[PDB]
Amino acid sequence: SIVTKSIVNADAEARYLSPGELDRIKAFVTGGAARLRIAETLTGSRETIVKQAGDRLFQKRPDIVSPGGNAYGEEMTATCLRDMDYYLRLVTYGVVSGDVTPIEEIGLVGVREMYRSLGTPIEAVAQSVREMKEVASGLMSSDDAAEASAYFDFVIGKMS
Amino acid sequence: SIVTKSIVNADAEARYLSPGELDRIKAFVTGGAARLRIAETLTGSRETIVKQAGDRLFQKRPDIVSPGGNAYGEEMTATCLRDMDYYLRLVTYGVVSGDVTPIEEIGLVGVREMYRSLGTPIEAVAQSVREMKEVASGLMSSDDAAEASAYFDFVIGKMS
Amino acid sequence: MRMFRITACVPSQTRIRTQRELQNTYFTKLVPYDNWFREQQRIMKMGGKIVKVELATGRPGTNAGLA
Amino acid sequence: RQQTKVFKLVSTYDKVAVKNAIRAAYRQVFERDLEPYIINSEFTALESKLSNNEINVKEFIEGLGTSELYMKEFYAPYPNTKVIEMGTKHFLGRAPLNQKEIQQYNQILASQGLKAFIGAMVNGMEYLQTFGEDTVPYRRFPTLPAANFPNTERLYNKLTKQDKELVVPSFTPVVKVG
Amino acid sequence: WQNEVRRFIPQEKKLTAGNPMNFLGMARSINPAANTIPKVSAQNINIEASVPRR
Amino acid sequence: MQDAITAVINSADVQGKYLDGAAMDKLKSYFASGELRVRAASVISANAATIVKEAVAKSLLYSDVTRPGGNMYTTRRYAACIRDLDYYLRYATYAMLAGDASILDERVLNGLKETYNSLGVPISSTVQAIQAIKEVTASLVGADAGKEMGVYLDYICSGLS
Amino acid sequence: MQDAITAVINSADVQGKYLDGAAMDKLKSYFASGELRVRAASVISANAATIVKEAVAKSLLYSDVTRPGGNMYTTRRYAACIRDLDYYLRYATYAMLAGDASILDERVLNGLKETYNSLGVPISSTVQAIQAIKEVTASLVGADAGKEMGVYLDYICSGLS
Amino acid sequence: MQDAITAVINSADVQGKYLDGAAMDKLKSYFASGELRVRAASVISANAATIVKEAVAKSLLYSDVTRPGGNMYTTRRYAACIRDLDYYLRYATYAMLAGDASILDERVLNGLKETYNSLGVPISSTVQAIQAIKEVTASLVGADAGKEMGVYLDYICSGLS
Amino acid sequence: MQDAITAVINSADVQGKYLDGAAMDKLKSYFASGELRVRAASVISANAATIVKEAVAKSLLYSDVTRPGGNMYTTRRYAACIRDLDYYLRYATYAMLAGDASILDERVLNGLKETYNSLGVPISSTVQAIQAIKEVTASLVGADAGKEMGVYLDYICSGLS
Amino acid sequence: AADVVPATIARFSQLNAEDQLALIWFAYLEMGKTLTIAAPGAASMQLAENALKEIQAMGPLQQTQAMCDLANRADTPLCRTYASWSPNIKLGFWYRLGELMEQGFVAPIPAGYQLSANANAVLATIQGLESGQQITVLRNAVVDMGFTAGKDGKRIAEPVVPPRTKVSIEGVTNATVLNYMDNLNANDFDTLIELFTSDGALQPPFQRPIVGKENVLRFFREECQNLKLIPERGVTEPAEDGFTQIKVTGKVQTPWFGGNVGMNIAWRFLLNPEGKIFFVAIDLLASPKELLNFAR
Amino acid sequence: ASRTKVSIEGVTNATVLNYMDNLNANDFDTLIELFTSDGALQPPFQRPIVGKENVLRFFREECQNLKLIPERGVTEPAEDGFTQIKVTGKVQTPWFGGNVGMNIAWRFLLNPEGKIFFVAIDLLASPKELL
Ligand SMILES: *[C@@H](C)[C@H]1/C(=C/c2[nH]c(/C=C3N=C(/C=C4\NC(=O)C(CC)=C4C)C(C)=C\3CCC(=O)O)c(CCC(=O)O)c2C)NC(=O)[C@@H]1C
Ligand SMILES: *[C@H](C)[C@H]1/C(=C/c2[nH]c(/C=C3N=C(/C=C4\NC(=O)C(CC)=C4C)C(C)=C\3CCC(=O)O)c(CCC(=O)O)c2C)NC(=O)[C@@H]1C
Ligand SMILES: *[C@H](C)[C@H]1/C(=C/c2[nH]c(/C=C3N=C(/C=C4\NC(=O)C(CC)=C4C)C(C)=C\3CCC(=O)O)c(CCC(=O)O)c2C)NC(=O)[C@@H]1C
Ligand SMILES: *[C@H](C)[C@H]1/C(=C/c2[nH]c(/C=C3N=C(/C=C4\NC(=O)C(CC)=C4C)C(C)=C\3CCC(=O)O)c(CCC(=O)O)c2C)NC(=O)[C@@H]1C
Ligand SMILES: *[C@H](C)[C@H]1/C(=C/c2[nH]c(/C=C3N=C(/C=C4\NC(=O)C(CC)=C4C)C(C)=C\3CCC(=O)O)c(CCC(=O)O)c2C)NC(=O)[C@@H]1C
Ligand SMILES: *[C@H](C)[C@H]1/C(=C/c2[nH]c(/C=C3N=C(/C=C4\NC(=O)C(CC)=C4C)C(C)=C\3CCC(=O)O)c(CCC(=O)O)c2C)NC(=O)[C@@H]1C
Numbered sequence A, B: 001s002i003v004t005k006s007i008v009n010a011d012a013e014a015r016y017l018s019p020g021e022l023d024r025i026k027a028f029v030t031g032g033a034a035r036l037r038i039a040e041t042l043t044g045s046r047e048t049i050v051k052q053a054g055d056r057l058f059q060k061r062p063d064i065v066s067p068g069g070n071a072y073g074e075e076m077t078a079t080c081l082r083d084m085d086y087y088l089r090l091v092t093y094g095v096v097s098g099d100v101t102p103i104e105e106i107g108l109v110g111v112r113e114m115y116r117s118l119g120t121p122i123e124a125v126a127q128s129v130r131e132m133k134e135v136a137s138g139l140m141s142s143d144d145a146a147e148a149s150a151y152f153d154f155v156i157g158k159m160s
Numbered sequence C: 001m002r003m004f005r006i007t008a009c010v011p012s013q014t015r016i017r018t019q020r021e022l023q024n025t026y027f028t029k030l031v032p033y034d035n036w037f038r039e040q041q042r043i044m045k046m047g048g049k050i051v052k053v054e055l056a057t058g059r060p061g062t063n064a065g066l067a
Numbered sequence D: 001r002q003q004t005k006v007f008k009l010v011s012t013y014d015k016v017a018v019k020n021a022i023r024a025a026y027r028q029v030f031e032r033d034l035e036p037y038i039i040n041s042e043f044t045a046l047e048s049k050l051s052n053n054e055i056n057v058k059e060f061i062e063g064l065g066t067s068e069l070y071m072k073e074f075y076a077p078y079p080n081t082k083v084i085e086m087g088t089k090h091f092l093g094r095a096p097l098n099q100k101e102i103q104q105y106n107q108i109l110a111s112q113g114l115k116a117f118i119g120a121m122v123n124g125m126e127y128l129q130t131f132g133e134d135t136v137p138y139r140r141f142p143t144l145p146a147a148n149f150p151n152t153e154r155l156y157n158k159l160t161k162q163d164k165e166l167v168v169p170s171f172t173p174v175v176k177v178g
Numbered sequence E: 001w002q003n004e005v006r007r008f009i010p011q012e013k014k015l016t017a018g019n020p021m022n023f024l025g026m027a028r029s030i031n032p033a034a035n036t037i038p039k040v041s042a043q044n045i046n047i048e049a050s051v052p053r054r
Numbered sequence F, G, H, I: 001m002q003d004a005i006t007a008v009i010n011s012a013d014v015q016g017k018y019l020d021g022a023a024m025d026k027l028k029s030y031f032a033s034g035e036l037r038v039r040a041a042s043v044i045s046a047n048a049a050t051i052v053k054e055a056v057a058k059s060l061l062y063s064d065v066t067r068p069g070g071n072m073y074t075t076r077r078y079a080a081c082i083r084d085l086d087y088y089l090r091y092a093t094y095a096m097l098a099g100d101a102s103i104l105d106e107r108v109l110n111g112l113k114e115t116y117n118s119l120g121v122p123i124s125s126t127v128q129a130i131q132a133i134k135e136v137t138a139s140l141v142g143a144d145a146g147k148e149m150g151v152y153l154d155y156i157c158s159g160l161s
Numbered sequence J: 001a002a003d004v005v006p007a008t009i010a011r012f013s014q015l016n017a018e019d020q021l022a023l024i025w026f027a028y029l030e031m032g033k034t035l036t037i038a039a040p041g042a043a044s045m046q047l048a049e050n051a052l053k054e055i056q057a058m059g060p061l062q063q064t065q066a067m068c069d070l071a072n073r074a075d076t077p078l079c080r081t082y083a084s085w086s087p088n089i090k091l092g093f094w095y096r097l098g099e100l101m102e103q104g105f106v107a108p109i110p111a112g113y114q115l116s117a118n119a120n121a122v123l124a125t126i127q128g129l130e131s132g133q134q135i136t137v138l139r140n141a142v143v144d145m146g147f148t149a150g151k152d153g154k155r156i157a158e159p160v161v162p163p164r165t166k167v168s169i170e171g172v173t174n175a176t177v178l179n180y181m182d183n184l185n186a187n188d189f190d191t192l193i194e195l196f197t198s199d200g201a202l203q204p205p206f207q208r209p210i211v212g213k214e215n216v217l218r219f220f221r222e223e224c225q226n227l228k229l230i231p232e233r234g235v236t237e238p239a240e241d242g243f244t245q246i247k248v249t250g251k252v253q254t255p256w257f258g259g260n261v262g263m264n265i266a267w268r269f270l271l272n273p274e275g276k277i278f279f280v281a282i283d284l285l286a287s288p289k290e291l292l293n294f295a296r
Numbered sequence K: 001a002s003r004t005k006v007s008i009e010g011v012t013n014a015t016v017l018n019y020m021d022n023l024n025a026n027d028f029d030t031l032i033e034l035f036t037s038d039g040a041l042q043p044p045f046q047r048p049i050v051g052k053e054n055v056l057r058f059f060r061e062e063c064q065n066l067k068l069i070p071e072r073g074v075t076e077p078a079e080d081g082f083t084q085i086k087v088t089g090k091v092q093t094p095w096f097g098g099n100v101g102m103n104i105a106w107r108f109l110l111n112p113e114g115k116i117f118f119v120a121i122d123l124l125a126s127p128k129e130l131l
C-alpha cells in the first residue's frame, strides 16, 4: 500500500521516511474511513456492478461473445464475469490499501502474456474495466467517484 | 540468405566458414531452381490463394468482420487482404533466401507492437497464415510442401 | 550491424573524482543500433549532452539486410 | 577487498596498459586466461577497436559477453538460473539482487536469449554507476540488499567448474501473493 | 423401513470463489446479445482502392 | 531536469539574491496550476496508448509514410515509430507536471535531431505526428490543459525542426 | 552436453579408437531416425504456443491450482508457469532432435527441484502439466514421434519428480 | 514485503473473498495505530544517530570486542557495526510503521545468519546491542511506540538467535 | 505440549511475573469451557470410529482419489488414509480437551507437510477431507463445541496447507 | 457490384446538409433492424465524452444549431473537435447522439419529418447492400463532415427550424395546479414564483424538501429546464385547516434526475386553503427499471 | 404488539407480515432474507440502495431500534410478474424526522417468487413543516 510504497522508496535511498512521506501517511490513515466506506460500497454492488458492466461491455464489443470471439457461450461469458469480479476485487484492494502496487502484485504483472496465451483481446478487457469505472461512478458520490476512478483508471492504463 | 547467416556466424567466431557452412551454401546454390519455382508459383497464384485463405479465415473467425471488429467495413477487410498479400510476399522473399531473416526483420520483429497499436487479433493472423499454408500446399507440389510448410510454420510460431 | 558513432560529454554532478576523467567525460564511442536507444536514454538520464551522433556503419532506410 | 587492482583505461596511448586492461577484462569476464580455451584469439577485432579508442571499455566488456565463447563456457552447460548467477558475477560483480532481478533476467533469457541478457546487464544504470565507461568490472563486496553479500561470497569463493549446484536458485518469499 | 440408497457419484464438491460456476447463472442472467454471421465473401473486394488510402 | 520551482530558484540564484515578489508570484501561479496539471496527467496516463493510436491513425496510417518505401514501413520501423511517439507523449506529460521545458531539452532533444538525420527519419512527418498528439490530448484533457500540453508538444517539434 | 552422435564419438574416443561396427550401427540407427525427428521438430515449432496453451487448458486451467490459494493465481505466476512450460517444450524438442537427454539434465534438472521448493512450486502439478504436454504434442506429431516425445517428457518429469 | 494494511488484503485474497467485517475492523485498528506509528517513526528518525550511539555506549564499548584483536577493533569494523546498528534501527522503524514484520525477514534477516557466521561476528553481542537499542528507543518514544519497536526488534533478534 | 492452563503458567514464567488479572480471566474462561470440552470429548470418542466413515464417504468416495491411479487406491493407501483421519480426529480432540494448539504444532503438523510431499499424497484432497470431518464432527458435537472443534481442524488444515 | 460503396458515397456527396443529416438520422432509425448494429466499444470513445457532455449540457435550440453547424461544417470549436477525430470516433459520436435522442437527453428531430426522395433512394440503396459496405458508406459520409482548414465548401446552409397547450388532469380541475404544471412545460417559473407563497416547500425526488422561496427559485432555474410533463390523472382531497392535498400522476418526456422519456411520476400538493401552494413533492415511482440508484 | 401479528388492512401475505415482525424484533439479519439479491431499498429523501449487504448496512446503521405501526394497505399486480403492495402506517419512533406523527408508506415490489425485489419507505408528511 501507500505505507509499503513509502517504505520501499525510503529503502531505495537508504534513509528514514521524509516528513512528506510521514504526513502523507498521516493524511491517509486519518482519512481511511472514507476509503474503507467506498470499498464497502463497491463490494456491496458487486453482483450488479459486474452485471451491468458486462452487459454494457457486450453491447459495446459483441465480437468477444459473437461467432469467433473468445467467450461465445454462457460458459465463457461466465468466465468473463469471473475475471470481471477478479478485477473489481483488485480495485477494492487498491482502494483500501490506497496504493496501486497490490494490483500490480495481483492482476497486472504478466497480464499481456496471460491474455495472449488465452487469445483474449486485452483492449476489450480495458473497455470492460472502463465500464466498471463508468457505472461505479454512476452509483457513488462524485468525490468518491474520483477516488475509486483513480484505481479504475490505473487498471485501464495497465490494460492498454 | 543463409550465406549472410553463415558469414555472420563465422565473423562472430573470427574464423573462415567451416565445412558444414560450405556444404550448406553448396546445397542452397545447387537447389536454387526449386526455390525460384516456388517463388514464381506463389507470385503467379498469389491473388487466388490470398483470397481463399482470407475466406477460410473468415469462416473460422467471423467476428473479425462482424460489425465492431477490426476487419469490419470493406476498407477494413481489404486491409486484411493487403496484409495477407504482404505476408505472402514476405514468405516468397524468404523462400528465395534460404533463411528466415527477411521474414524476421520486415514483418516479424516488432509485429506484436504494431498489431497491438492497430488492435488486430494476432492469433487471427496466425490462423490466416495457417490457411495460407494449406492453400499453398494444395496448389503446390508434394515434395515442395515440406519446404514451404517449414517457413509457414516458422512464421506461425513466431507471430502466434 | 548498422553501427553508430557518438561523441558525448557526460559531466560529474555528484562526485569530485580525483583521477583523470576525459576518457569517460567527453568520449567518441561506437554503439550498435539495437543498444543505441538504451545507451542514449542512459546518457540523457546521467545529465550528459549528446554532442554528436552519426550512423558510421550501415545504410539509412535499408528495408532488408540490416545484419 | 583491498588487495586488488582496478583497471581503468585512462589513455589508449600506452599500448602496454591497453593490453593489460584487455587481459584483465578477459580474466574477469571468463574467470580464466583464455589461452587453453580457444584455437586463436577471436576478440582481436575488439582489441584493435579499443586500442584505437573507437570504443570504450564498457563496449569491450559487452563484446566479451556477447561472444560465442561466453555462451560456450557459462551459458551452454548451465540452466538459466545458473547463467543468471554467473553473468551477474562476471559483469556486475555480485550475485542477483532479489527475486525481481531474477524474474527480469529470466524474462530476457526466455524472450531474447543470452545476448539481450548481457546487453541489459551491461548497459544498466548500476553498471555505469559502479564501473563507469572505462573501468573493467571487478569483484564487489556489497553490503546491501539482504543476502547479497553471502551470495556473492559463495559465488566468488569457489573456483571455476567447482560444482554444478545453484548458490542462489531463488529467494524464498516470506509472503506469497494470492 | 426407509433406506438410504447411496448413489454412485461422489458428493459434489462445494463451489468456491474462484470457480466461475457461481457466475454461470449470472451469464444466463446476462444473456449477452450475440452477432449474426457476417455475409461477406471477400472475392468481390479488389485490393487497389478497397483498402483505405488517406 | 528542472521544474517551475527549480527554474525560479536557479533564476534567482544565478544573480545570487533571494526570491523577490516576482519569483513568489510565479511560484503561486505554478501552485495554482498544479491541480489542473495533475488532473491532465491522470487523464493522459489513462489514455496514452489510445492517444498514440488515433494520433498515428489520423497522421500516419494509410499515408505515404506507412506504405512500402516509406520510413514507417515494416513492422520493425512501425514499432520504432510507435515507441517514439509513446516516449514523446510520456515526456510531454512529464514536462506538464514539471511546468518547465528543461526535461524536454536535456532528455528528449539532445541527440535526437541528428539521430533522425543519421537514420533519415522524416522530420516533417514526425512533426505532424506530434501535432496529432497535441490535438488528441487536447480533445481529452480539455482546452485549459490542452493549450499547455500543446505548448510542450510544440517545443518538442521546434527542437526537432 | 552430448547427443547420440556425440555419444558414439566420445565413446569411441575415450578408448582412443576409430568407429567400430557397434558405433557404425548405432550411427545407422540414428540416421534412420533422421527425417522423422526433424519433421517432428518442425511440427512442434509450428504451433509452439499451441501445445502449451491446450496443455494448460486441459490439466491446470480451471481448477484449485489456478484458483485463489493455488500457485497459479495472479497474472505473474500464470505467465511464470507459461514460461516454464515454454522452457520444457523447447528443451524437449532440443533433446529429441539431438536424441539424448544430456541437454535436459544439464539445463533443466540441475537444481530445478530445489528451485521450485524454494518457491514452493507444486512438483506434482508440474508433473501432470508435462503429462498433458505429452498428448498435446502426440496429437500433432504422430505416434512414434509422439512416443519419443512422451519418453523425453517422462524423463523430464522423473528428474523433476 | 507486507504491512498491516496489505496483510489483510493477502489474507482475504488467498481464499479469493472480498473484504468482510473482520478485514474492515483490522484495517480500522491499523489506522487507529497509525497516529502513534507515524509519531514514533518521526521521533526515531530525528534521533537515530544518538540512539545508536547510546546503545553502543552501554552494550559494546569498553569490552573485549572493542579491545585490540576484537571484532570491534580496526575502526573500519567499528564503522561497520555503527552502520549495521543503523540498518537494524531503520528497518525496525520500517516494520513498525508498516505494522507487519515481513520486511525484517525479507530485507534484514534474509541471509544474515551465515553472513555473521562467515564474518565471525558475535551473534549474541549483536543481539545484546539490539536489545540496548530497543531499551534506548523505548525510553525516548514512549510506552506504546516503544512496545511496537521492541516487538519488531525482538523479532529481528529471534531471527538472529 | 501445553494446555491453556500450562500455557498461561509458562507465559507468566517467561516474564517472571505472577498471575495477574489476565491470567485469572483466561484461567476462568478455560474452566468455564471445561464442561463443554469434556462433554464434547465424550460425544466424539463415542463415534470416533463411525464419524470418520461419513467424513470420508462425502469427501473421498467414488472419486478420482479412490480409483486405480489415485493415491487412495489399494488397501494400504485407503487404510492409511482412514488411519490419518483417525489420527487427526483423535489429536484434535486432544487439543480440544487441552484447549490449545500446542500439541498440533509438534505432534501432528511437525514434519507432516513434507512427509505428505515425499509420499506424494494429495495435500489438497486431505484439506477437503479434514473440512468434511469438520462438518461431520460439528453435526454431532453441537454448535459451540462444533466451533471449538472446527477451529482446531482448520488449524490442522492451515499447517497442512 | 464492386463500385456499390464508392457509387453510394458519390450519391451521398451531392445531397445537401439537410438531406445528409436526414439520411443519417433515418439510417440510425433503421439501424439494427435493417442496417448494421452498433458496437461503440470498437472505437476509442473515451476521447469523445467531452463533446458529448458539452452537447448534452447545452440547450436544445443551440443543440440543434451546433449539430447543423457540424452537418454543414461550420467554423466552431465543436466542429473542429469533431474534425480532429478518427472516422470510427465520428461514427460512434453520431450513434451516441442518436441514442441520446432516442432517450431524449438531447433535442430530437422536428416532429413528423419525412426523408426526401433523393435521401430515401440513397437510404434504400444503403439497405440493399451488405453490412460491410454499409458501414463503409456511413464512415465515408461522416468523415468529410466537420470543418477542416483547407479546400472545402457547402452550397446551401441548413438553418435551424425557428420553432404549448393547457394540460388536462383527470379528476382535478384546480386552477393553481394547472397554471403551475402548464408554465413549467412552458418554462414560466417567474409566474410560479408569484404563484406560490413564500414558504417555498418543494420535495425533489430522492431528496429532502427544499425550504425558502429563493431556494425554490434556484431549484426551478437550476434543475428544471425544458421539462416536458404529461399528467395522466389526479385526485384532490381536503387536508388539515382546509389545505388541499392533490396527488397527480403523469409522465415526463425528458431526462429528469435520471428519468426516462416514459416514467410514472407523481406530485403531492399541499396548497393553502386561502393561499396557493404550501408544499410540492415530486416522486418517481419505481418499476422493473432502476438506473438512478446510488446505493450508499 | 411486536409478538402478535401486525394488524394491517388489505395485506394478507406471509412475506410482508414476516418483514413487519422481523423489523419490530430488530433481527435485520433474519429480516433481509425476505429481500432479493438484486432487491433494493428506497430510503426517504434518498435514492435507492442496491446490493444485499448495502441493505444490511442501511438496517444496521440507520434502522436502529425503530418502531413502525402499519394501519392499512392495498395490493395489485405489476409488470414482469411483480406485485405492487402499497401499505400505509404511522411511525412511533424517531426515523429521519417527524416523531410519532409521520405516515410511512411502504411500496413493496415483490418478486413472482415472493421475495421483495424493491421496497420503498415513503415518509408521508403531515401539515407539520420544518423537516
Ligand atoms: C582525547 C585525546 C580525545 C578523545 C579520545 C577518546 N576516545 C574514546 C573512546 C574510544 N576511542 C576508540 C578508538 C579506537 N578503537 C580502535 O580500534 C582504533 C584503532 C584501530 C581506534 C582509534 C574507541 C573504539 C573508543 C570507544 C570504545 C573503547 O573505548 O574501548 C573516548 C571516550 C568516549 C566515551 O564516551 O567513553 C575518548 C575521550 N576524545 C576527545 O574528545 C579527544 C579528541
Ligand atoms: C577553475 C579554476 C576553472 C573552471 C573549471 C571547471 N572544470 C570543470 C569540470 C571538468 N574539468 C575537467 C578537466 C579535467 N579532468 C581530468 O581528468 C583532466 C586531465 C587529467 C582535466 C584537465 C573535466 C573532465 C571536467 C568535467 C568532469 C568532472 O567534473 O569531473 C568544472 C565544473 C563544470 C560543471 O559544472 O560540470 C569547472 C567549474 N571553471 C572556471 O570558471 C574556472 C576558470
Ligand atoms: C486481417 C485478417 C487482420 C487485420 C488487419 C488489418 N491491418 C490493418 C492495418 C495495417 N496493417 C499493417 C501491416 C503491415 N505493414 C507492413 O509494412 C507490414 C509488413 C510489410 C505489415 C504486416 C499496417 C502498417 C497497417 C496500418 C495501415 C497502413 O498500412 O497504412 C487494419 C486496419 C486497422 C485500423 O484501425 O484501420 C486491419 C483491419 N485486422 C484483423 O482484425 C485481422 C486479424
Ligand atoms: C514516428 C513518429 C517516426 C519514426 C520513428 C522511428 N524511430 C526509429 C528509431 C529510433 N528512434 C529513437 C528514439 C529516441 N531515442 C531517445 O533517446 C528518445 C527519447 C525518448 C527518442 C524518441 C532511437 C534511439 C532510434 C534508434 C534505435 C532503435 O530504433 O531502437 C525508427 C527506425 C529507423 C530505422 O529502422 O532505420 C523509426 C521508423 N519514423 C517515422 O517516419 C515517424 C516520423
Ligand atoms: C471477458 C469480458 C474477456 C475475456 C476473459 C476470459 N478469461 C478467461 C479465462 C481465464 N482468465 C483468467 C485470469 C486470471 N486468473 C487469476 O487468478 C488472475 C488474477 C486474480 C487473472 C487475471 C484465468 C486464469 C483464466 C483461465 C481459466 C481459469 O480461470 O481457471 C476466459 C476463458 C478462456 C477459455 O478458453 O476457457 C475468458 C473468455 N475474454 C474476452 O475475449 C473478453 C474481452
Ligand atoms: C508450471 C509448469 C507450474 C508452476 C510453476 C511456477 N514456477 C514459478 C517460478 C519460476 N519457475 C522457474 C523455472 C525454471 N528455472 C530454471 O532454471 C528452469 C530451466 C530453464 C526452469 C524451468 C523460474 C526461473 C522461476 C522464477 C523466475 C520467474 O518468475 O521467471 C512460479 C512462480 C513462483 C513465485 O511466484 O515465486 C510458478 C507458479 N505453477 C503451476 O501451477 C504449474 C504446475
Ligand SMILES: *[C@H](C)[C@H]1/C(=C/c2[nH]c(/C=C3N=C(/C=C4\NC(=O)C(CC)=C4C)C(C)=C\3CCC(=O)O)c(CCC(=O)O)c2C)NC(=O)[C@@H]1C
Pocket (backbone or CB within 6 Å): I060, I065, I071, I072, I076, I077, I078, I080, I081, I082, I084, I085, I087, I088, I091, I107, I108, I112, I115, I119, I121, I122, I125, I126, I129
Ligand atoms: C487420507 C485423508 C489421505 C491419504 C492418506 C495416506 N497416508 C499414507 C501414509 C502416511 N500417512 C502418514 C501420516 C501420519 N502418521 C502418523 O503417525 C501421524 C502423526 C499424527 C501422521 C499425520 C505417514 C507418516 C505415512 C507414511 C507411512 C504409512 O504407510 O502410513 C498413505 C499411504 C502412502 C504410501 O505410499 O503407502 C495414504 C494413502 N491418501 C489420500 O489420497 C487421502 C487424501
Ligand SMILES: CC1=C(/C=C/C(C)=C/C=C/C(C)=C/C=C/C=C(C)/C=C/C=C(C)/C=C/C2=C(C)C(=O)CCC2(C)C)C(C)(C)CCC1=O
Pocket (backbone or CB within 6 Å): B066, B067, B068, B069, B072, J017, J018, J019, J021, J022, J024, J025, J027, J028, J036, J037, J038, J039, J040, J041, J042, J043, J064, J087, J088, J089, J091, J092, J094, J095, J097, J098, J101, J107, J108, J109, J110, J113, J135, J138, J158, J159, J160, J161
Ligand atoms: C458497428 C461499428 C460502429 C459503427 C456504428 C454506427 C453505424 C454508428 C452510426 C450511427 C448513426 C448512423 C447515427 C445517426 C445519427 C444522426 C443524427 C443524430 C442526426 C439527427 C438529425 C437531426 C436531429 C436533424 C433534424 C432536422 C432539423 C433539426 C432541421 O432543421 C429540419 C430537417 C432535419 C431532419 C435536418 C463503430 C464505428 C462504433 C465501431 C466499429 C463498428 O463496426
